[PDB]
Design an enzyme around this catalytic site. Structure first.
Site, PDB file in Angstrom:
ATOM      1  N   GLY A 146      -3.971   1.239   3.053  1.00 21.83           N
ATOM      2  CA  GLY A 146      -3.767  -0.190   3.192  1.00 21.83           C
ATOM      3  C   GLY A 146      -2.684  -0.800   2.347  1.00 21.83           C
TER       4      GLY A 146
ATOM      5  CB  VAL B  28      -2.357   2.008  -1.302  1.00 29.37           C
ATOM      6  CG1 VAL B  28      -3.021   3.125  -2.061  1.00 29.37           C
ATOM      7  CG2 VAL B  28      -2.113   0.836  -2.222  1.00 29.37           C
TER       8      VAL B  28
ATOM      9  N   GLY C 184      -1.715  -3.072  -1.194  1.00 28.56           N
ATOM     10  CA  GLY C 184      -2.043  -3.638  -2.513  1.00 28.56           C
ATOM     11  C   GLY C 184      -1.060  -4.732  -2.899  1.00 28.56           C
TER      12      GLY C 184
ATOM     13  CE  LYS D 289       0.628  -2.429  -5.395  1.00 23.65           C
ATOM     14  NZ  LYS D 289       0.339  -3.163  -6.695  1.00 23.65           N
TER      15      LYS D 289
ATOM     16  CG  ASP E 202      -4.271  -6.198  -7.156  1.00 25.21           C
ATOM     17  OD1 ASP E 202      -3.574  -5.178  -7.464  1.00 25.21           O
ATOM     18  OD2 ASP E 202      -4.480  -6.478  -5.939  1.00 25.21           O
TER      19      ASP E 202
HETATM   20  N1  LIG Z   1      -7.993   3.614  -2.577  1.00 26.80           N
HETATM   21  C1  LIG Z   1      -7.413   3.095  -3.669  1.00 26.80           C
HETATM   22  N2  LIG Z   1      -7.623   3.655  -4.853  1.00 26.80           N
HETATM   23  C2  LIG Z   1      -7.065   3.120  -6.061  1.00 26.80           C
HETATM   24  C3  LIG Z   1      -6.221   2.045  -5.951  1.00 26.80           C
HETATM   25  C4  LIG Z   1      -5.958   1.490  -4.721  1.00 26.80           C
HETATM   26  C5  LIG Z   1      -5.135   0.393  -4.681  1.00 26.80           C
HETATM   27  C6  LIG Z   1      -3.953   0.133  -5.333  1.00 26.80           C
HETATM   28  C7  LIG Z   1      -3.267   0.847  -6.262  1.00 26.80           C
HETATM   29  C8  LIG Z   1      -2.930   0.228  -7.477  1.00 26.80           C
HETATM   30  C9  LIG Z   1      -2.239   0.978  -8.398  1.00 26.80           C
HETATM   31  C10 LIG Z   1      -1.862   2.267  -8.199  1.00 26.80           C
HETATM   32  F1  LIG Z   1      -1.255   2.968  -9.146  1.00 26.80           F
HETATM   33  C11 LIG Z   1      -2.170   2.907  -7.004  1.00 26.80           C
HETATM   34  C12 LIG Z   1      -2.930   2.187  -6.117  1.00 26.80           C
HETATM   35  N3  LIG Z   1      -3.597  -1.130  -5.048  1.00 26.80           N
HETATM   36  C13 LIG Z   1      -4.469  -1.607  -4.146  1.00 26.80           C
HETATM   37  N4  LIG Z   1      -5.432  -0.681  -3.941  1.00 26.80           N
HETATM   38  C14 LIG Z   1      -6.557  -0.850  -3.055  1.00 26.80           C
HETATM   39  C15 LIG Z   1      -7.102  -2.240  -3.137  1.00 26.80           C
HETATM   40  C16 LIG Z   1      -8.216  -2.424  -2.109  1.00 26.80           C
HETATM   41  N5  LIG Z   1      -7.557  -2.197  -0.843  1.00 26.80           N
HETATM   42  C17 LIG Z   1      -6.987  -0.866  -0.608  1.00 26.80           C
HETATM   43  C18 LIG Z   1      -5.950  -0.614  -1.651  1.00 26.80           C
HETATM   44  N6  LIG Z   1      -6.564   2.065  -3.575  1.00 26.80           N
END
Ligand SMILES: Nc1nccc(-c2c(-c3ccc(F)cc3)ncn2C2CCNCC2)n1
Lengths: 349, 21
Positions: free
Chosen positions: A27, A34, A29, A49, A164
């Protein structure tokens, strides 16, 4: 430098170190998308991300730097931290894209409340973990400001992490998820009543807790005034002190325009609830920011007696936010961001 | 208005969530 490889993903190009394999979208972020991946070097599942056009505006570039600095600082079990940060660029001069890596989490609380009923024991442990992360964030003088179920990442075994945090900065700013954010926003920030502080985040936890218990949004406002109507409907109208603490003489005139509503007794609202859960809610959803329980106080509340441990609820190291007062060009925010990508040291393996 | 809890509290141990697909 590692060998990178290229691949297209949801109609954008991804260039990543070869250790990261099997990329699969999960999805969007904050300012990006991501993918899940498997990290063949450590054997971990990771979330990668890719920031979206990180340097296509001053606001974006400064937000990129903010976010990278925050994520480098956060080292807590209930706050998202960084396993890796990389760019396919060999020098500042070609620097355009930033990728952040963390431990893959299985879902977020928004999707959770949408497909199962939560018991009081789930609510206990989920809320505990939120307050524990928040005690940490707040100790570093960071305010999340946008706490909501979709910003709370969880796994099948109920482990939770906040994400976030500290990325919002103004209610004059355009951002995604605005309507959901408002449902959990403390009234003083929403409506610019006064200079606010970190207690804004506890209002949000109260809203989320009420939602996890009942499965329904506590204050699903359609706009600013409707949101306020819904809030005062539960907590009552502001008593004596609070009107004396609204600089915003515009809000103040509007507010005293409103005919008095009484404070409901939450025990009579949240039928079937643990009285401890009810009593925590009473302490979090107080209109007077000065009177809300803090994260650190809330952890000691008897509702969490089964999980609370005064010796395993740590504070954060000092965090320098002095860059926030600076007024710079896209290229200076870019170079600062590049520095932080280059100086990254991965956590203890 | 009343907002009943999804699962009324009962007086008395390992937690799980069904993951979205
Ligand atoms: N599945 C999952 N696991 C960990 C984080 C995220 C993530 C990140 C993100 C942030 C930092 C990073 F370094 C890598 C990823 N940003 C938004 N999201 C999720 C937030 C909820 N919706 C799906 C994406 N998603």
């Amino acid at each position: 430098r590692p060998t990178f490889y290229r691949q297209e993903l949801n109609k954008t190009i991804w260039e990543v170190p070869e250790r990261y394999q099997n990329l699969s979208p999960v999805g969007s972020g904050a300012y990006g998308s991501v993918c899940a991946a498997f990290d063949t070097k450590t054997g971990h599942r990771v979330a990668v991300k890719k920031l979206s056009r990180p340097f296509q505006s001053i606001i974006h570039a400064k937000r990129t730097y903010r976010e990278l600095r925050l994520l480098k600082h956060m080292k807590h079990e209930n706050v998202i931290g960084l396993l890796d940060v990389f760019t396919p660029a060999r020098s500042l001069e070609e620097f355009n894209d930033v990728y952040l890596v963390t431990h893959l989490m299985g879902a977020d609380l928004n999707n959770i409340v949408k497909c199962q009923k939560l018991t009081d024991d789930h609510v206990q442990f989920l809320i505990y973990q939120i307050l524990r992360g928040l005690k940490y964030i707040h100790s570093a003088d960071i305010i999340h400001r946008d706490l909501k179920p979709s910003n709370l990442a969880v796994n099948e075994d109920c482990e939770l992490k906040i994400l976030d945090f500290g990325l919002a900065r103004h209610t004059d700013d355009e951002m995604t998820g605005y309507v959901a954010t408002r449902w959990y926003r403390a009234p003083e920030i929403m409506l610019n009543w006064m200079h606010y502080n970190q207690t804004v985040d506890i209002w949000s936890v109260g809203c989320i807790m009420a939602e996890l218990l009942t499965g329904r949004t506590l204050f699903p406002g359609t706009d600013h005034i409707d949101q306020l109507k819904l809030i005062l409907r539960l907590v009552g109208t502001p008593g004596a002190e609070l009107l004396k603490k609204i600089s915003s003489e515009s809000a103040r005139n509007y507010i005293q325009s409103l005919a008095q509503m009484p404070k409901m007794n939450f025990a009579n609202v949240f039928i079937g609830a643990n009285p401890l859960a009810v009593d925590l809610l009473e302490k979090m959803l107080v209109l007077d920011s000065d009177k809300r329980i803090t994260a650190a106080q809330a952890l000691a509340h008897a509702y969490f007696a089964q999980y609370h441990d005064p010796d395993d609820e740590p504070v954060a190291d000092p965090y320098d936010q002095s860059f926030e007062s600076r007024d710079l060009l896209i290229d200076e925010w870019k170079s600062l961001t590049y520095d932080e990508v280059i100086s990254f040291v991965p956590p203890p393996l | 208005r009343v907002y009943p809890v999804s699962v009324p509290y009962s007086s008395a141990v390992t937690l799980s969530l069904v993951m979205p697909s």
